[PDB]
Amino acid sequence: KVFGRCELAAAMKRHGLDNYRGYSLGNWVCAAKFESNFNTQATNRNTDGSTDYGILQINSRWWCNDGRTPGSRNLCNIPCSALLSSDITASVNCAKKIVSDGNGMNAWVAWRNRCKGTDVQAWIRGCRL
Ligand SMILES: CC(=O)N[C@@H]1[C@@H](O)[C@H](O[C@@H]2O[C@H](CO)[C@@H](O)[C@H](O)[C@H]2NC(C)=O)[C@@H](CO)O[C@@H]1O
Ligand SMILES: [Cl-]
Numbered sequence: 001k002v003f004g005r006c007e008l009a010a011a012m013k014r015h016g017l018d019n020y021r022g023y024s025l026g027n028w029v030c031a032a033k034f035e036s037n038f039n040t041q042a043t044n045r046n047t048d049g050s051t052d053y054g055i056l057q058i059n060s061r062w063w064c065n066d067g068r069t070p071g072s073r074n075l076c077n078i079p080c081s082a083l084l085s086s087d088i089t090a091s092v093n094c095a096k097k098i099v100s101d102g103n104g105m106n107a108w109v110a111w112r113n114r115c116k117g118t119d120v121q122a123w124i125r126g127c128r129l
């Protein structure tokens with residue numbers, strides 16, 4: 001599924017990401033935009049052979065099991081394919097674990113490079129939330 005911006009904002013808000021660990025909703029929407037272009041089916045292969053999955057491009061090196069990232073962890077205890085669902089619950093719940101792990105949203109490269117320190121509230125501007 002390719003979410004609309006506000007649709008995703010609303011979904012993320014309903015799933016408790018607004019101000020989760022102090023990260024306002026726009027951070028999450030911004031991260032999703034630049035990680036996946038709001039596409040839950042996005043996958044990208046990393047140089048180390050892991051793959052990033054889903055709307056928040058959660059990687060299989062650490063967070064999910066895709067059966068083809070040897071020596072990786074599965075800290076979200078999910079098949080990576082669960083992160084591709086049109087239902088973002090699995091991504092959100094895993095993202096909550098990630099962002100809780102001490103490094104905040106810096107785990108999301110795109111967030112660090114494209115959202116962090118920007119006016120992320122713009123990403124939820126106009127949305128009914
Ligand atoms: C939370 C999450 O999974 N974020 C992804 C990053 O982990 C991806 O970065 C890449 O992650 C792999 C596995 O840890 C690293 O081996 C690789 O060096 C790293 N790539 C970069 C440029 O840092 C990122 C890839 O675009 O996608 C999500 O942000
Ligand atoms: Cl868009």
Ligand SMILES: [Cl-]
Nearest residue numbers: 024025026121
């Ligand atoms: Cl915000």
Ligand SMILES: [Cl-]
Nearest residue numbers: 067068069070
């Ligand atoms: Cl694996």
Ligand SMILES: [Cl-]
Nearest residue numbers: 011087088089
């Ligand atoms: Cl959902």
Ligand SMILES: [Cl-]
Nearest residue numbers: 021103104105
């Ligand atoms: Cl933080």
Ligand code: NA
Nearest residue numbers: 035052057110
């Ligand atoms: Na990425």
Ligand code: NA
Nearest residue numbers: 060064072073
């Ligand atoms: Na894994």
